[PDB]
Amino acid sequence: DIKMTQSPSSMYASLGERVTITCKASQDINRYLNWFQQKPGKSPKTLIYRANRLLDGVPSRFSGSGSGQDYSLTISSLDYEDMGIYYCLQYDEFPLTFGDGTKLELKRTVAAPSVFIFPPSDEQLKSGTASVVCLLNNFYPREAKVQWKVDNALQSGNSQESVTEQDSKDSTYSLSSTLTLSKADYEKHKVYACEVTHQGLSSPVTKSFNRG
């Protein structure tokens, strides 16, 4: 299988900025390369064929280049409608193979998250399970580290997190993290804490509560 590697995985860019993203094949693919664009919640749309030709209707601010193993897609002047995920694909040989995609997002100023922690409800505790939830609200950029500590012991393997898409009006993200324990375990400890490290904060922010 011809491996397609895209770089970078994501990047922030400003309106009007010149943007270039890259795709590398594990071998020569003779310019048999498509580029696709996918907006959140939408079907992909095909922009480029043969590495450098635009499909009918594709805006001229788009262009492609490269040959052999090394290719690129350039947007000469970024518009708001251009945010989304960009994928490459080779059709030189079977099997047809995609790159993992490059995500283009809108650049803005740093914004530190507001952090909230929520204990489990009494109603949930009657089911034998306890969920503790940590909210990071309206921050930028997306990268953040969230740690759970129970009576100050770092937790691992018992949490899941999820993140919103970039907000259409302030370009921030929000993140939810859920710590899940049995009722028995939850009742066996006192201090529950969520600790957040982010570029916009000058020290980690910890929100906590005491069971009871």
């Binding site: 992909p44 095909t46 064929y49 694909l89 929520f118 949930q124 939830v133 899941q160 929000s174």
Partner: protein, 207 residues
């Protein structure tokens, strides 16, 4: 919400053509898995020659009806790893196989039974407060959430669901509001899980 199949089971997808001459094009199936990777599934030339990746060879069959203008995907021995959005696509020549993208279909392969969610309050802590609802243990996707029947939209964030190890989904919805209004205002989250015909309302208030 979409087709549901038990592991090992069978399914037939169909894609009816409109707005082009179906018999002129190579037709393909492509899927997008929960981690948003795209993967080629099958192709068939205008004359009926088929092409497959090894991951589905022997399990899936692509076929076409050039008289009724319909594309088919017959799936056998389905695996939980086949869970995805499935797209129909058409192409030809140097455009490639995926020049234009068609009708999508969600396919979920899981042993889980359809189940409505439990809804628990995320209670505002003892000038801005956050509150919400945890929508837990439902199957399949999706659920919808609104606040105060749609009257409250500002500052609302509803997160993507996560798949738990139990095979059931979980998600939270939150909103930020003035602390001042915690006394005078009533905040209710409205949950709808159409696949199980379940509607739940939860009033979220300071403990």
């Amino acid at each position: 919400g979409g087709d549901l199949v038990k592991p090992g089971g069978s399914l037939k997808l169909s894609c009816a053509a409109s707005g082009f001459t179906f018999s002129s094009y190579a037709m393909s199936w492509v899927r997008q898995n929960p981690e948003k990777r795209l993967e080629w599934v099958a192709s068939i030339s205008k004359g009926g020659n088929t092409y497959y990746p090894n991951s589905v060879k022997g399990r899936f069959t692509i076929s076409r009806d050039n008289a009724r203008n319909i594309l088919y995907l017959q799936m056998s021995s389905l695996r939980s790893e086949d869970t995805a959005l499935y797209y129909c696509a058409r192409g030809w020549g140097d455009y490639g196989w995926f020049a234009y993208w068609g009708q999508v279909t969600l396919v979920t392969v899981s042993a889980a039974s359809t189940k409505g969610p439990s809804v628990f309050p995320l209670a505002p802590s003892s000038g801005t407060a956050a509150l919400g609802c945890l929508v837990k243990d439902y199957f399949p996707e999706p659920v919808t959430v609104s606040w105060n029947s749609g009257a409250l939209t500002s500052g609302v964030h509803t997160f993507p669901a996560v798949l738990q190890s139990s095979g059931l989904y979980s998600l939270s919805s939150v909103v930020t509001v003035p602390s001042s209004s915690l006394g005078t205002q009533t905040y209710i989250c409205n949950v709808n899980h159409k696949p199980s015909n379940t509607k739940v309302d939860k009033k979220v208030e300071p403990k």
